[PDB]
């Protein structure tokens, strides 16, 4: 029984960019950024390409799963910064991993990319169409950031996260998932004619808390799980204040809410998978634990996934 | 099972004939026709990819007698997305007024539609979705090198869509098989500028072999012979490749549907557009076994065998 996570990995760019470094780039400050978001630093893929980052996170994940690339049945990569029009970055990565002939493609869902991709993987496993699936969330957001706009350039970072899921016969499994989208709210968060990230910060914040709360409550009810029974909440890392307001609305103690936005900023699709990896490595996740993942992103995509590790 | 209850398309009205092409590049009607089987293609002028996708979807929904808000998921396959984000699937969702509906784009170039249909099938089969809208839409005219005659005579613009649902009858996707091979990126890829580039002769050969193999694979999986297939709906890449495949599978041309002569190669939109026409022309009836297959950039390829 169950879609089970048997391996996780990540790749964090070599270049660190603190708020102090940014102060010299745009009219901003450490105090402002820190208090309004909780971000202290962010990684920048100045040297690495999206493909390279995704491949590294995937390799570590496969090593952890003790699974050969060829044993994969599917590779799903979520990103909003593809290497090229085509082939998909999933294909470029597959090539680097030597996962010959392996089914591969990218998906677009912005910040909701990983949970969308994980939900897809679960559909393939639950339909008996796949057994081993590699799900990657990789982003080189720095290429989509307007570095002259102190309003948005201080929120994003680069990096990649990956997880390997398989069909197990034990109790590990995804208990419930729920994804939503609302294209009529494109304006709140979207790319312009040149691909630059644009947003309506205030409106977005409201919608973010309300929407993630709603879908989180939905998966909990569907799974017949109460908030107090959640072992750990791994939310998209967009703003520490949003995360706090969300935890409050769900009545989940801060101690059970994983946060690492302070060191990576908002990495979109790679956000949750990177947090999951560190959470595991920090001894905060053990088999049997109920993990709640949730996110909201451009296009106004959002959802939640409740699983028993 | 997974049943197609509605289909639809959208094609720009602007026609790019081989004679128009003779006026922009050093090519001829004779060469094009003989080498590709193409005579005409549609080109989007005022339509955005979102508009075309929306029009194809609306027809599919009407055919299915289903309202936009009764959809559980929307999957759109394209290589010419409207913007960085939101996904074109989200933009289409807004135009359809399918409020709150799960939606995303996938990248698999020419195998876009069958990949998306395979995913749709996984959601219905796992019982996670009931009604799914799958779209193949491309405005390839924006990604073509018009200075290049070796490739600018092959592509057109268009959108195709299908609405699949979980039925309590024999309609169902019987078997699917999808593959990808990144090490073969060089045969068919976009350059640093997004322009479509390819190693035509090598891609032609690899295309037939891989497509024959995957087709044979879904057939032995479903327990049926090529002779038992009612209609083959291949990606409309090249009539000559289509003939080579049909020849290998030992399937008469009468059972191979082609409309590349009037729409050219429309990548992800290719199959759903051909399917819709085949249905409208009475070439597809409930119970018929339909084989869909394609190969595209990245070197994606696969096959879907279904009972209409």
From Swiss-Prot, chain A:
Principal location: cytoplasm
EC number: 2.3.1.180
Signal peptide interval: none
Subcellular location: Cytoplasm
Keyword NADP: no
Pathway annotation: Lipid metabolism; fatty acid biosynthesis
Annotated spans, ACP-binding: 237-241
Pfam families for the chain: ACP_syn_III, ACP_syn_III_C
Keywords: Acyltransferase, Cytoplasm, Fatty acid biosynthesis, Fatty acid metabolism, Lipid biosynthesis, Lipid metabolism, Multifunctional enzyme, Transferase
GO cellular component: a single term: cytoplasm
Catalytic center residues: 111, 236, 266
One Gene Ontology term from the biological process aspect of the record: fatty acid biosynthetic process
Reaction equation(s) it catalyzes: malonyl-[ACP] + acetyl-CoA + H(+) = 3-oxobutanoyl-[ACP] + CO2 + CoA
Keyword Acyltransferase among UniProt keywords: yes
GO MF annotation terms: 3-oxoacyl-[acyl-carrier-protein] synthase activity; beta-ketoacyl-acyl-carrier-protein synthase III activity
Enzyme's top EC category: transferase
UniProt family annotation: Belongs to the thiolase-like superfamily. FabH family.
Free-text function comment from the UniProt entry: Catalyzes the condensation reaction of fatty acid synthesis by the addition to an acyl acceptor of two carbons from malonyl-ACP. Catalyzes the first condensation reaction which initiates fatty acid synthesis and may therefore play a role in governing the total rate of fatty acid production. Possesses both acetoacetyl-ACP synthase and acetyl transacylase activities. Its substrate specificity determines the biosynthesis of branched-chain and/or straight-chain of fatty acids.
Assembly with partners or alone: Homodimer.
Domain notes: The last Arg residue of the ACP-binding site is essential for the weak association between ACP/AcpP and FabH.
Protein name in UniProt: Beta-ketoacyl-[acyl-carrier-protein] synthase III
Organism: Aquifex aeolicus (strain VF5)
Gene that this polypeptide is encoded by: fabH
């Amino acid at each position: 029984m169950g879609t089970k996570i048997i391996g996780t990995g990540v790749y964090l760019p070599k270049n660190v960019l603190t708020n102090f470094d940014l102060e010299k780039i745009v009219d901003t400050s450490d105090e402002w950024i820190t208090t309004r978001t909780g971000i202290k630093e962010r990684r920048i893929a100045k040297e690495e390409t999206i493909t390279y980052m995704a491949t590294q996170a995937a390799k570590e994940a496969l090593r952890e799963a003790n699974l050969s690339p060829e044993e994969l049945d599917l590779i799903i990569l979520a990103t909003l910064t593809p290497q090229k029009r085509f082939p998909s970055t999933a294909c470029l990565v597959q090539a680097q991993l030597k996962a010959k002939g392996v089914y591969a493609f990218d998906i677009s869902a912005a910040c909701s990319g990983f949970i969308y991709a994980l939900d897809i993987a679960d559909s393939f496993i639950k339909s008996g169409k796949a057994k081993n699936v590699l799900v990657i969330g990789a982003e080189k957001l720095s290429e989509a950031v307007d570095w002259e706009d102190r309003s948005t350039c201080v929120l994003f970072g680069d990096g990649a996260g990956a997880v390997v899921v398989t069909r197990s016969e034990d109790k590990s499994d995804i208990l419930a998932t729920r994804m939503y989208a609302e294209g009529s709210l494109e304006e709140l968060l979207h790319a312009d004619n040149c691909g630059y990230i644009r947003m309506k910060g205030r409106e977005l914040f409201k919608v973010a808390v309300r929407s993630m709360e709603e879908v989180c409550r939905e998966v909990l009810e569907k799974a017949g799980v109460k908030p107090e029974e959640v072992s750990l909440v791994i939310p998209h890392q967009a703003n520490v204040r949003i995360i706090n307001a969300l935890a409050e609305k769900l009545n989940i103690p801060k101690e059970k809410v994983f946060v690492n936005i302070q060191k990576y900023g908002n990495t979109s699709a790679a956000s949750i998978p990177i947090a999951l990896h560190e959470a595991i490595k920090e001894g905060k996740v053990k088999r049997g634990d109920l993990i709640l993942m949730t996110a909201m992103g451009g296009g106004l995509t959002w959802g939640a996934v409740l699983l028993r590790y």
